[PDB]
Structure formats: C-alpha cells, structure tokens
Amino acid sequence: GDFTADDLEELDT
Amino acid sequence: SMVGQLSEGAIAAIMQKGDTNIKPILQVINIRPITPPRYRLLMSDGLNTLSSFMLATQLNPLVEEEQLSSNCVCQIHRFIVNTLKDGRRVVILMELEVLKSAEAVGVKIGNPVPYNE
Incomplete structure (x- = not known):
C-alpha cells in the first residue's frame, strides 16, 4: 500500500 | 472472457522472473497521489494485484486529464523495477497506452488477489 x-524521500529521485 | 483481455501472470513475471521486455496489458484498480505530484497505482493482471506501481513524472498528464483512471485498461510499453533502501520493490511505468477508458470497461475485471510483496 x-x-x-x-x-x-527515496522515490522523489 | 473479460479477464482474457489481461496479461494474466505478468505481475509474477515482473516480480519473480525479472522480465523487463514484456508489454503486459493491465487494469488500473486505484490511483493514489503521494507526497510535484507523484502517483502510486494499484494495478491488476487479472490474477494478482500489485500495489507498488509508480507513474514516471512524464506520464502525470494522463492522470491530470483523467484518461488514466480506476478501471481503465492499459498496455505497458516501458518500465523499470527499482529496489528501495528498505527492500520494497517499485515498478516505475515509463510508457503506456490507455487501450480502454474506465467508462468503457466499467468494472474491476475478475477477482485478482494481492501479490506477496
């Protein structure tokens, strides 16, 4: 989910 | 059958076999903004659902202009799987085509169950 x-934070990149 | 229109087993092929060149046909079950907006998708191949699809930013207009929406059927043309620091794997959709609008499909197809993530 x-x-x-x-x-x-990591997905932004 | 309506499920016959979907690429049954494609989610397992992406997650288990590391298939990257398939172009599966999937149904959007739900779209969730997360936080420039990013969209997480719950997608179905008719057998399984996967909660960890993410739309590349370049595809955001498809959501913004409501062509990609819950129950529409799409074909994935380019995607990348990436692993996050905690081990969760995310399927990033880079290119896709909406084959049938939500209004033309009208229902969730079949009874897919959550893939073990």
Whole structure:
C-alpha cells in the first residue's frame, strides 16, 4: 500500500 | 472472457522472473497521489494485484486529464523495477497506452488477489 516516510524521500529521485 | 483481455501472470513475471521486455496489458484498480505530484497505482493482471506501481513524472498528464483512471485498461510499453533502501520493490511505468477508458470497461475485471510483496 502506501509508502513509508523513508520510502517517500527515496522515490522523489 | 473479460479477464482474457489481461496479461494474466505478468505481475509474477515482473516480480519473480525479472522480465523487463514484456508489454503486459493491465487494469488500473486505484490511483493514489503521494507526497510535484507523484502517483502510486494499484494495478491488476487479472490474477494478482500489485500495489507498488509508480507513474514516471512524464506520464502525470494522463492522470491530470483523467484518461488514466480506476478501471481503465492499459498496455505497458516501458518500465523499470527499482529496489528501495528498505527492500520494497517499485515498478516505475515509463510508457503506456490507455487501450480502454474506465467508462468503457466499467468494472474491476475478475477477482485478482494481492501479490506477496
């Protein structure tokens, strides 16, 4: 489902 | 059958076999903005659903102008699988074609179950 806070930082790139 | 229109097993082929050159036909189940906006997609191949599809930014107009929407059927033409720091794998959709609009399909096809992520 949703991404964790840490994942969100990495997906931006 | 309606599920006969989908690439049944393509999600397993992407996740388990590392297939990168297939061009599977999938149904959008749900689109979720996450946070310039990015979109996560719950996609179905008729057998399984996968929650970790992400739209390349270049495809955002398809969501913004509502051609890519829940229940539409699309063919993936280019994608990349990437692994995040925590081990979760994400399928980034780079090129796709909407073959049938949500309104022309009208329902979730079949009864796909969540792939083990």
